[PDB]
Amino acid sequence: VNSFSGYLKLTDNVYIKNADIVEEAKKVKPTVVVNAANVYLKHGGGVAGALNKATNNAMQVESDDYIATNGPLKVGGSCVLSGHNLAKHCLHVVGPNVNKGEDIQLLKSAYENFNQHEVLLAPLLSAGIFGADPIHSLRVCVDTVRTNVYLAVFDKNLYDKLVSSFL
Numbered sequence: 005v006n007s008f009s010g011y012l013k014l015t016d017n018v019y020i021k022n023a024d025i026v027e028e029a030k031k032v033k034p035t036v037v038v039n040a041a042n043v044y045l046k047h048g049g050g051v052a053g054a055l056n057k058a059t060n061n062a063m064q065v066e067s068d069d070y071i072a073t074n075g076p077l078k079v080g081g082s083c084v085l086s087g088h089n090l091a092k093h094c095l096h097v098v099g100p101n102v103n104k105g106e107d108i109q110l111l112k113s114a115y116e117n118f119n120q121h122e123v124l125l126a127p128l129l130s131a132g133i134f135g136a137d138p139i140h141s142l143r144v145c146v147d148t149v150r151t152n153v154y155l156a157v158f159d160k161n162l163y164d165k166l167v168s169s170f171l
């Protein structure tokens with residue numbers, strides 16, 4: 005049993021809810037929250053901007069030190085950093101950004117990072133300002149992630165479309 009509440013069960017391991025991932029993280033304090041990161045860990049907008057704002061910019065300070073030491077992530081890659089006030093850990097995962105012309109086939113590689121964690125609170129990778137079709141992102145998630153993932157969808161309209169179109 006875990007603390008996640010109000011989720012619709014899509015599969016054996018994938019759950020979904022219409023929710024603000026910041027508000028959900030603040031309530032649950034999950035072991036892992038996933039950030040929709042870019043390779044530079046520049047948390048300017050979308051899930052990343054909202055998560056970083058909720059940490060009072062501590063996520064960005066930590067991230068800048070990580071990049072200064074290690075250099076940029078790969079598209080499809082990830083790193084584990086602090087979850088600050090939101091979670092124990094933040095898994096920063098880089099999905100392809102369609103608005104930068106990145107290979108959508110890298111979305112499966114991105115979701116494979118989730119398999120290193122038994123339970124996660126996450127957004128749909130490459131959705132929102134990353135430009136991918138969120139229906140596609142949910143299908144790749146279900147077909148790739150084997151660990152238990154609780155998906156928070158910010159938009160109510162999109163949530164209802166994801167549920168009502170789910171195969």
Ligand SMILES: NC(=O)c1cnccn1
Pocket residue numbers: 023024025026027049050051054132158
């Ligand atoms: N939870 C949010 O504030 C958020 C903002 N932008 C995109 C997705 N989620």
